[PDB]
């Protein structure tokens, strides 16, 4: 299947590169490094060889979310976004960009997102879970009240926000002490991101800004399997859930969320997500360079779904969501 | 369907009753405490009315796992088990018992499991995740080396171990701060229990004792959905995983684990589990009294599976597993 669109597709600057060291063995770092740093050459060749037309590119993790001085976070984000704009400009038929944002500061993040969308032509933002800010004794999650004006900006711009993983801070990771093998994509990434997404849904954010679009990778980080139980546990009790949101968690999931196939090339899992959130809200993605493009594409080529849904998940959903077949993207 | 066996079926003694109070609104506590304390009467009438032949009974949560003094923990476990044996003896065709265990002290736990199985006729153990012990700076997980002689005893007795949930300790639960609605069965229970299971699998415990049988409630606490990813993330990297176990995590999941349907009455979830671990390793359970028996049975009656698998999940698999 030619013409696919992929949107969990990462790169690094020299400035952010070392954030990804640790996620593979030392013997494999030279390869990973080379993939992270390459946008124009081998990446596009692999795209051609595996039927990907468009990668929506994003900076690696945690990157800006781990820069605790918010003035410095803003500087790094601006440099990364300017670099990404230049790279997109070199092969504008094959690439679009997601914004890196200094979520340490709601005002700075909102201003940078405006600049990325209006001046740089980016199509959304990607953020690696919670932020570290020296001013806060605690990690910053985006349900907290100070973010609500930032979200108002996201909805006004009408671009999606990709809530990507990061690892929990060590003081929030004691269950994994001695079992470091569970950190990262094995498990801890998914728990961290699932809970952050649920915090957004419970907070009532989507009652106030109901047109927001949030994207989750990895088939939704376990959410579809357990979504029934989130709302329906202890169903004999007739009560009002003790969160500020007005409706069921599943309502916000169904209405405000999209899931990608990144790093979760498993047909059973895809089928469960289809039967829970529907194929209209599922997007192809690879997680290159942490996963192989050929692994992602070969799995998706043959996974057990209808040809109609293979086209929607492969490219139709993303083309519509990111308005890529519209005049502003094609001609301006 | 009559003849079902259910095995996440809870009761409390007066000694452990109040552990359950925080899990329902104040207005529902009278109903809940009456369900927890009743074994012989309404509980059996509801089994009759909804086709359950046998409940395998277990003490409520966290119960013994929250009793920090291990001497006292062992005293509480013994009393609860003696009580449970007495209650089972009144209606022996309808009930069996799971042991409550003082997991704070591996020797005491092994001794109590032996007693419950050989002397009281119990058919396994049910433990509410990690233990708190005054003597330990950290919560106790059962992958830790001091529990291996305990697991040797479980395998020698050849009875299953039900790894049931509890909530994380507050210092290990900051991600849920200002979001207490996520604690308990909503989500925190499953995360805590999935990782405890995974810690067991990656520790190599099942290389050393391969006939161990571990049971998880709630359709396996999200494990089947993400199990491919657990082993196959970053697949282009060719390397030995950095855990002591010799094989893939999925190999231990498939070979040593069984899942129940407790509190997870969702057909899509069941089918995903069927297509990952197989219907021979799934078992009907309700989570009474925290879930209604009628909701559990009515869902299961009509869920979208073969009649052969409805019989196996309903009673066949549990009959084989517990040698009834
Ligand atoms: O998303 N991921 O799962 C992924 C990353 O984006 C960064 C490191 C490892 C990895 O698998
Ligand atoms: O298993 N549970 O989810 C369950 C309990 O055993 C204890 C409290 C509430 C509940 O839903
Ligand atoms: Mn990624
Ligand atoms: Mn239970």
Q: What is the DSSP string of B206-217?
A: HHHSTT--EEES
Give the gap in angstroms from C-alpha B89 to the nearest C-alpha of chain A. Answer: 30
Q: Which is nearest to A108 in space by CA: A139, A136, A73? A: A73
Phi and psi of A99, rounded to 5°? -70, 135
C-alpha R_g of chain A: 19
HSE, side-chain direction, 13 A CA sphere, residue A62: 20
Give the gap in angstroms from C-alpha B91 to the nearest C-alpha of chain A. Answer: 27
Q: What span, in angstroms and rounded, lies between the C-alpha atoms of B116 and A67?
A: 55
CB contact under 8 A, B202 and A181: yes
CB atoms within 10 A of CB B271: 18
Cβ pair B143, B199 in contact under 8 A: yes
Instruction: Give every CB contact of residue B50 below 8 A, 6+ residues apart in sequence.
Output: B293, B294, B296, B297, B298
Which residues of A fall in the annotated binding site for Mn(2+)? 8, 10, 164, 287
CA angle A169, A174, A176 (to 5 degrees): 95
Is omega for the bond preceding B289 within 30 degrees of 0, making it cis? yes
Provide the 8-state DSSP code for B300: H
- For A156, A293, B62, the CA distances from A91, given in Å and listed in that order, are 28, 19, 59
Cβ pair A59, A13 in contact under 8 A: yes
* Ligand 2 pocket, residue B296 CB under 6 Å: no
- For A112, B197, B239, the CA distances from B242, given in Å and listed in that order, are 40, 17, 9
Cβ pair B196, B129 in contact under 8 A: yes
Resolution (A): 1.6
Relative to beta strand A257-260, strand A95-97 is unpaired
Q: Which is nearest to B221 in space by CA: B267, B264, B168? A: B264
Query: Counting atoms of ligand 1 from 1, which one is nearest the CA of A10?
Result: 6
CB contact under 8 A, A291 and B236: yes
Q: Which CATH class is domain B1-324?
A: alpha beta
Q: Report CA torsion sign: B223, B224, B226, B232.
A: positive
Determine if residue B287 is labeled as part of a ligand binding site. yes
Give the gap in angstroms from C-alpha B196 to the nearest C-alpha of chain A. Answer: 8
Cβ pair B131, B121 in contact under 8 A: no
Q: By the CB < 8 Å criterion, does A274 face chain B? A: no
- For A59, B39, B261, the CA distances from B88, given in Å and listed in that order, are 61, 9, 23
Q: What span, in angstroms and rounded, lies between the C-alpha atoms of A237 and A55?
A: 47
Q: By the CB < 8 Å criterion, does B226 face chain A? A: yes
Q: By the CB < 8 Å criterion, does B24 face chain A? A: yes
Cβ pair A129, A192 in contact under 8 A: yes
Residue A177 is among the residues annotated as catalytic for this protein: no
Burial class (CB in 10 A: 0-12, 13-18, 19+), A173: middle
Domain residue ranges in chain B: 1-324
C-alpha R_g of chain B: 19
Catalytic residue selected from B19, B105, B287, B309: B287
**What homologous superfamily does CATH list for A1-332?**
Metal-dependent hydrolases (3.20.20.140)
CB atoms within 10 A of CB A241: 15
Nearest-Cα residue of chain A relative to residue B296? A235
Q: By the CB < 8 Å criterion, does A229 face chain B? A: yes
The arrangement of strands across the sheet holding B4-11 comes to: B4-11, B52-59, B95-97
Q: Is A269 helix (H, G, I), strand (E, B) or coil?
A: helix
Experimental approach was: X-ray
Closest listed ligand to the CA of B63? 2
């Amino acid at each position: 299947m030619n013409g696919k669109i992929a949107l969990e597709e990462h790169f690094a600057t020299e400035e952010t590169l070392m954030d990804s060291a640790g996620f593979v063995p030392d013997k494999d770092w030279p390869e990973l490094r080379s993939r992270l740093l390459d946008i124009q050459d081998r990446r596009v060749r692999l795209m051609d060889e595996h039927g990907i037309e468009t990668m929506i590119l994003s900076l690696n993790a945690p990157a800006v979310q781990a820069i605790a001085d918010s003035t410095r976070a803003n500087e790094t984000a601006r440099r990364a976004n300017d670099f990404l704009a230049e790279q997109v400009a070199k092969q504008p038929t094959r690439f679009r960009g997601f914004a890196a944002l200094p979520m340490q500061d709601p005002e700075l993040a909102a201003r940078e997102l405006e600049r990325c969308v209006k001046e740089l032509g980016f199509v959304g933002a990607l953020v690696n879970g919670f932020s570290q800010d020296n001013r806060s004794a605690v990690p910053l999650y985006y349900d907290m009240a100070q973010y609500w004006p930032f979200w108002e900006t996201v909805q006004a711009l009408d671009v999606p926000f990709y809530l990507h993983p990061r690892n929990p801070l060590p003081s929030d990771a004691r269950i994994y002490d001695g079992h470091a093998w569970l950190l990262g994509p094995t498990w801890a990434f998914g728990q961290e991101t699932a809970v952050h997404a649920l915090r957004l849904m419970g907070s009532g954010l989507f009652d106030k800004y109901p047109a927001l679009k949030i994207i989750l990778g990895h088939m939704g980080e376990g959410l579809p399997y357990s979504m029934w139980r989130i709302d329906h546990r202890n169903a004999w009790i007739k009560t009002t859930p003790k969160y500020p949101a007005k409706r069921k968690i599943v309502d916000y999931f169904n209405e405000n969320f999209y899931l990608t196939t990144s790093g979760n090339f498993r047909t059973q899992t895809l089928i469960d997500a289809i039967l829970e959130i529907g194929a209209d809200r599922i997007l192809f993605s690879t997680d290159w360079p942490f996963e192989n493009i050929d692994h992602a594409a070969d799995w998706f080529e043959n996974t057990s779904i209808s040809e109609a849904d293979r086209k929607k998940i492969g490219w139709g959903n993303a083309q519509n969501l990111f308005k890529l077949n519209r005049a502003e993207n094609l001609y301006f």
